[PDB]
Amino acid sequence: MKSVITTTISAADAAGRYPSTSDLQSVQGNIQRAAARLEAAEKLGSNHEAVVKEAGDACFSKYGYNKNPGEAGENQEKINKCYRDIDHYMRLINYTLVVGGTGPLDEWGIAGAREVYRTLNLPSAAYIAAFVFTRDRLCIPRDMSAQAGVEFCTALDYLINSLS
Amino acid sequence: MLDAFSRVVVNSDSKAAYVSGSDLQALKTFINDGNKRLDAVNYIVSNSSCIVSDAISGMICENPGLITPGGNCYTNRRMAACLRDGEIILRYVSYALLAGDASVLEDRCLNGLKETYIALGVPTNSTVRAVSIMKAAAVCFISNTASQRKVEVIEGDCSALASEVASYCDRVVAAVS
Numbered sequence A: 001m002k003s004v005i006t007t008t009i010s011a012a013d014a015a016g017r018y019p020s021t022s023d024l025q026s027v028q029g030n031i032q033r034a035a036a037r038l039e040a041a042e043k044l045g046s047n048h049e050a051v052v053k054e055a056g057d058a059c060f061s062k063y064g065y066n067k068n069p070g071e072a073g074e075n076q077e078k079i080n081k082c083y084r085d086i087d088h089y090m091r092l093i094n095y096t097l098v099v100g101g102t103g104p105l106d107e108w109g110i111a112g113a114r115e116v117y118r119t120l121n122l123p124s125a126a127y128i129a130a131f132v133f134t135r136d137r138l139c140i141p142r143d144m145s146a147q148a149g150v151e152f153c154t155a156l157d158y159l160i161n162s163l164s
Numbered sequence B: 001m002l003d004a005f006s007r008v009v010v011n012s013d014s015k016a017a018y019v020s021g022s023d024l025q026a027l028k029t030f031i032n033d034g035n036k037r038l039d040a041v042n043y044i045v046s047n048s049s050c051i052v053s054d055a056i057s058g059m060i061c062e063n064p065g066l067i068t069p070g071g072n073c074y075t076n077r078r079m080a081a082c083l084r085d086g087e088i089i090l091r092y093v094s095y096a097l098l099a100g101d102a103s104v105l106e107d108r109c110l111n112g113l114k115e116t117y118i119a120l121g122v123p124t125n126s127t128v129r130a131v132s133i134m135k136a137a138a139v140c141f142i143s144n145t146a147s148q149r150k151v152e153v154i155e156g157d158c159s160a161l162a163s164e165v166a167s168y169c170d171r172v173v174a175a176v177s
């Protein structure tokens, strides 16, 4: 899983090297940023159902057609599965934040998303709708601090560039 | 390859759980003890050819039959393949302590080690006393308790960090025994 500490060890390992100063200077950066990403993580972990709901609703307020027969929110089992994907993705954004590396979002949510949504006829636009709304809801003393908001906001931009 | 933090999200995923306040509190202590962990890795790495020449020479003065014909550290190719192997174990020990997690060692070093060792004929009973001396050396370098070499750190407690290095060395023994 890509993180700061995984990316220096694999590289040192590739070179058959013991860890050196650049590897110890790198891990210290992880520790300087830990406070601000664990803060965001805590806040989404605490009130996540509230933001996933919001977020789900937003795709359907933008793309009402999904409710039509033959489409991906034609019935409630399906609509329920859409909100469950926004929770799956937000649990992966909480995971990315604790790890301080996109490896969790990369392995479990991004890899193969493109093949699964094409075969099952799920529009990437509709997932982008959700994440833009979730991203832009953030009020950066209200909901969390400024630098934890940097962590939240662009942990979500990483997902949006992945689908687009 | 996983670290301390991805260990907690691997564990949270399985239960379909976001990372919880308590898990989140285990991680804060590792943030708190972050400067000491770098010092602990620094002392091993800076005395790294020492830990290994003494590990391998210890094994030898304890079993001279190793440098006898048919003993596996007999010929120079062989003496060298074993210092090389001890050099590999310590480096994955150093990696694991940097990560706060054993998986790089498990995957990238210890997977296949007893097996390969059976085939080459190298004596796993003498391998274990090289690793035990290494442990005894590493534990006391991060504790600044080395006989010949003392360093100047700001004082505090590092026994927790000593316990996991011992534990990474113990893993290695367990896997070839």
Ligand SMILES: *[C@@H](C)C1=C(C)[C@H](CC2=N/C(=C\c3[nH]c(C[C@@H]4NC(=O)C(C)=C4[C@@H](*)C)c(C)c3CCC(=O)O)C(CCC(=O)O)=C2C)NC1=O
Binding pocket: B047, B050, B051, B054, B055, B057, B058, B061, B062, B132, B133, B136, B137, B138, B140, B141, B145, B146, B147, B148, B149
């Ligand atoms: C027979 C010829 C013997 C050898 C060789 C041998 C080796 C043992 N080393 C043990 C522990 C240990 N290694 C060192 C290395 C060391 N000390 C320094 O200060 C510096 C510098 C070096 C590297 C060169 C350390 C740090 C220790 C800890 C002991 C100490 O007071 O420093 C050891 C004991 C194993 C155990 O506790 O089970 C050996 C065996 N001894 C021979 O008989």
Ligand SMILES: *[C@@H](C)[C@H]1/C(=C/c2[nH]c(/C=C3N=C(/C=C4\NC(=O)C(CC)=C4C)C(C)=C\3CCC(=O)O)c(CCC(=O)O)c2C)NC(=O)[C@@H]1C
Binding pocket: A059, A066, A072, A073, A077, A078, A079, A081, A082, A083, A085, A086, A088, A089, A108, A109, A116, A120, A121, A122, A123, A126, A127, A130
């Ligand atoms: C609103 C966003 C969209 C919606 C979604 C929808 N999801 C599926 C099916 C799947 N979606 C997932 C996604 C994940 N599962 C995971 O394990 C993870 C990673 C940890 C995620 C984020 C997968 C893999 C599937 C396939 C399996 C399944 O049936 O759940 C469906 C069902 C598809 C169908 O038509 O039967 C739906 C409804 N629907 C919408 O309205 C959106 C466009």
Ligand SMILES: *[C@@H](C)[C@H]1/C(=C/c2[nH]c(/C=C3N=C(/C=C4\NC(=O)C(CC)=C4C)C(C)=C\3CCC(=O)O)c(CCC(=O)O)c2C)NC(=O)[C@@H]1C
Binding pocket: A043, A044, A047, A050, A051, A054, A136, A137, A138, A139, A140, A143
């Ligand atoms: C500044 C962006 C704008 C602002 C915001 C505003 N937010 C709410 C209420 C909610 N928005 C959130 C967002 C989150 N809650 C969290 O804990 C997290 C962390 C992952 C986020 C980013 C949620 C879920 C709500 C609902 C819960 C609640 O009432 O607290 C409001 C309330 C009114 C409303 O829903 O519109 C406001 C005032 N105010 C502005 O207009 C700003 C430009």
Ligand SMILES: *[C@@H](C)[C@H]1/C(=C/c2[nH]c(/C=C3N=C(/C=C4\NC(=O)C(CC)=C4C)C(C)=C\3CCC(=O)O)c(CCC(=O)O)c2C)NC(=O)[C@@H]1C
Binding pocket: B056, B066, B071, B072, B073, B078, B079, B081, B082, B083, B085, B086, B088, B089, B108, B109, B110, B116, B120, B122, B123, B124, B126, B127, B130
């Ligand atoms: C003292 C430590 C012991 C000893 C060791 C010994 N090792 C070999 C040969 C090999 N051991 C390895 C193992 C690894 N090399 C790696 O790339 C890694 C990472 C996964 C490890 C830890 C391998 C693959 C070999 C085979 C090829 C090679 O020799 O490098 C030997 C040589 C045996 C021979 O005669 O060909 C020896 C001597 N010998 C002892 O007496 C010890 C107790």
Ligand SMILES: *[C@@H](C)[C@H]1/C(=C/c2[nH]c(/C=C3N=C(/C=C4\NC(=O)C(CC)=C4C)C(C)=C\3CCC(=O)O)c(CCC(=O)O)c2C)NC(=O)[C@@H]1C
Binding pocket: A021, A024, A025, A028, B032, B033, B034, B035, B036, B037, B038, B039, B040, B042, B142, B143, B144, B153, B154, B155, B156, B157, B158, B161
């Ligand atoms: C057990 C290991 C020994 C021990 C360690 C000890 N270290 C500190 C304080 C600091 N550690 C460092 C050193 C490094 N961190 C880095 O940034 C790097 C990377 C290139 C290194 C090598 C630093 C910078 C400090 C002090 C300054 C600061 O505020 O960051 C302590 C004090 C408590 C603490 O963890 O801050 C201790 C306990 N002390 C022993 O007694 C050991 C045997």
